[PDB]
Amino acid sequence: CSCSSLMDKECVYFCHL
């Protein structure tokens, strides 16, 4: 699981780092 911009913490919580 990964997002476009790991920077955007919102996008992180998603996959949960």
PDB file of C-alpha atoms in Angstrom:
ATOM      1  CA  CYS A   1       0.000   0.000   0.000  1.00  0.00           C
ATOM      2  CA  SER A   2       1.329   3.421  -0.997  1.00  0.00           C
ATOM      3  CA  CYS A   3       0.079   6.948  -1.770  1.00  0.00           C
ATOM      4  CA  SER A   4       1.181   9.638  -4.239  1.00  0.00           C
ATOM      5  CA  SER A   5       2.954  11.848  -1.721  1.00  0.00           C
ATOM      6  CA  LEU A   6       4.048  10.125   1.472  1.00  0.00           C
ATOM      7  CA  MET A   7       4.696  13.639   2.707  1.00  0.00           C
ATOM      8  CA  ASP A   8       1.022  14.502   2.984  1.00  0.00           C
ATOM      9  CA  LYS A   9       0.393  12.770   6.293  1.00  0.00           C
ATOM     10  CA  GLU A  10      -3.236  12.385   5.324  1.00  0.00           C
ATOM     11  CA  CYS A  11      -2.085  10.090   2.500  1.00  0.00           C
ATOM     12  CA  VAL A  12       0.012   8.183   5.058  1.00  0.00           C
ATOM     13  CA  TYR A  13      -2.568   7.331   7.708  1.00  0.00           C
ATOM     14  CA  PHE A  14      -4.253   5.580   4.798  1.00  0.00           C
ATOM     15  CA  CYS A  15      -1.675   2.828   4.342  1.00  0.00           C
ATOM     16  CA  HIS A  16      -0.383   3.449   7.835  1.00  0.00           C
ATOM     17  CA  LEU A  17       3.296   4.010   6.912  1.00  0.00           C
TER      18      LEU A  17
END
